[PDB]
Amino acid sequence: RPTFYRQELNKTIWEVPERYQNLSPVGSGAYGSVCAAFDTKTGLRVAVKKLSRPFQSIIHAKRTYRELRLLKHMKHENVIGLLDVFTPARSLEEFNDVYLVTHLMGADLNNIVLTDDHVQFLIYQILRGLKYIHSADIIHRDLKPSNLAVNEDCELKILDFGLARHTMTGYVATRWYRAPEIMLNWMHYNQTVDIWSVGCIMAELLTGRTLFPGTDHIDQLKLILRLVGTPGAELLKKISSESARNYIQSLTQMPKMNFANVFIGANPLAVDLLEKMLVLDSDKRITAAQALAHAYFAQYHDPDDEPVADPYDQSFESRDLLIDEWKSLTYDEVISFVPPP
Ligand SMILES: Cc1ccc(C(=O)NC2CC2)cc1-n1cnc2ccc(N3CCN(C)CC3)cc2c1=O
């Protein structure tokens, strides 16, 4: 057991191992406050997130469990993983706090504001990371610039995947980058919700503008159909909702724009890949693996260095347990954590 020390940082008491020094608030992450810190053991800069009231309710407790399990499983360069997890609790009965320690990247894509080459490298990394999480049947669901962490090398990791509700978790998504299908629940969804997000992000990297800055669900939908065209009979067949079909066919029928007119003077391959990401029909949207093999990524693509993940057990997601059952499960996961080399 390590030596802990306490420290007031903006409202709450942080209690952390002495190996972590110079704690420095950097605002909110998902479900808690994050400090940058210096790890004296490794000489690394790290992000430390203290979860906010992890066991206050079934939602908090389950989501504490989910986040921890997610982090422990991720071993991939373009996906955030777990350097350390600690609690100041000496036993289960006083277990009330969970701290999660990862690499500290130093910026995000939301700050960034980029030549065609940077876009290539950056989107390549997103897709490579996405291929890895999709293979373990984990989906991000709220991929967006603010959770794409990058360092001054343009190296990139994805954060905050697996947290947004499947079909509550208390996680707050950002409208502008969501696949229309999961925003309007208008048709079943799959892993390619994240590919739409990649589309919106890639578009913003090339033009400087948010592609679809809607003020609500309906405005947003209006902006999307202005680009991609109102769907024909083929896609309209696949939508159950009487009202979603109403909206689509009631807005004046929009023709599909030429993507070369919108993403002016972009690499034609960039344009082409956008055309394959930003299609309304989820069954026809390009996957992460297929997008990696696209010609736009020829300087970066390597079939033997685009790994998939080991099988991730998430049968727990379908379980309705008490807070204390989730808590014990979390505590087990904490006690059995082995650091990386
Ligand atoms: C610590 C941590 C734990 C877990 C996870 C995570 O992805 N979990 C899911 C299972 C995938 C992520 C992080 N993490 C890592 N580095 C960061 C670096 C900076 C920041 N800010 C910087 C900008 N400010 C305005 C706002 C916030 C937050 C973070 C941050 O939340």
Q: Which of 160, 219, 281, 320 is catalytic?
A: 160
Locate the ligand 1 atom nearest the alpha carbon of residue 70 and give its number: 10
Q: Are strands 20-29 and 12-17 parallel, antiparallel or unpaired?
A: unpaired
Cα separation values, 287 from 53, 127, 130, 168, 199, Å: 37, 9, 9, 27, 12
CA of 60 to the centre of ligand 1 (A): 17
CA of 279 relative to ligand 1 center, distance in Å: 30
* Domain range list for the chain: 1-106+309-338, 107-308
Residue nearest atom 22 in ligand 1 by C-alpha distance = 26
DSSP 76: B
Hey, whose CA ends up nearest to atom 15 of ligand 1?
Answer: 47
In this structure, whether the domain defined by 1-106+309-338 belongs to CATH 3.30.200.20 is answered with yes
Please list the residues that pair with 28 across neighbouring strands.
Answer: 33
Closest of 142, 171, 127 to residue 277, by C-alpha: 127
Tokens read off for 41: 């053991």
Quickly list H helices, 90-240: 116-135, 180-183, 193-207, 217-228, 233-236
The upper half-sphere exposure of residue 254, i.e. CA atoms within 13 Å in the direction of its Cβ, equals 18
Distance between CA atoms of 131 and 173, rounded to whole angstroms? Answer: 21
Quick check: CB of 159 below 6 Å from ligand 1? yes
Q: How far apart are CA 81 and CA 340, in angstroms?
A: 10
Using CA atoms, how far residue 25 sits from 12, 36, 46, in Å, is 12, 6, 12
In this structure, what token pair is assigned to residue 147?
């959770």
Give dist(CA 22, CA 335) in Å, integer. 26
Q: CA 186 from chain center: how many Å?
A: 22
From the candidate CATH numbers 1.10.510.10, 3.40.50.970, 4.10.490.10, 3.40.50.20, the one assigned to the domain spanning 107-308 = 1.10.510.10
Going by alpha carbons, the residue nearest to atom 6 of ligand 1 is: 160
Residue 254's nearest CA partner among 218, 229, 223 is 229
**Which approach determined this entry?**
X-ray
* Residue with the two structure tokens 């690394």: 44
DSSP 14: E
Q: How many angstroms separate the CA atoms of 107 and 26, rounded?
A: 11
Q: In what order do the strands lie in the sheet with 20-29?
A: 20-29, 32-39, 44-51, 99-103, 84-86
Instruction: Label residue 67 exposed, middle or buried (CB < 10 Å: 0-12, 13-18, 19+).
Output: buried
What is the whole-number distance in angstroms between the Cα of residue 159 and the centre of ligand 1?
6
Output the CA 188–ligand 1 centroid distance in Å. Answer: 29
Under 8 Å between Cβ of 220 and 248: no
Question: Tokens at residue 262, please?
Answer: 């919108």
Residue with the nearest Cα to atom 29 of ligand 1?
29
The verdict on whether residue 26 carries a ligand-binding annotation is yes
Q: Which of 80, 110, 314 to mutate to test the pocket of ligand 1 (most atoms within 8 A of CB)?
A: 80
Task: Determine the Cα–Cα distance for residues 156 and 142; give it in Å rounded to an integer.
Answer: 17
Looking up tokens 């001054």 gives 152
Burial class (CB in 10 A: 0-12, 13-18, 19+), 233: exposed
User: What is the experimental resolution, given in Å to one decimal place?
Assistant: 2.4
Q: CB of 182 within 8 A of CB of 141?
A: yes
* 32 is an annotated ligand-binding site residue: yes
Instruction: Give me the amino acid identity at 293.
Output: A
Phi/psi of residue 174, each to 5°? -110, 115
Q: Let me know if 160 is a catalytic residue.
A: yes
| Closest by CA position to 278, among listed 188, 214, 185, 197 | 197
C-alpha 54/C-alpha 65 separation (Å) is 9
Describe the strand order of the beta sheet including 156-158 as a list of residue ranges. 107-108, 148-150, 156-158
27 is in an annotated binding site: yes
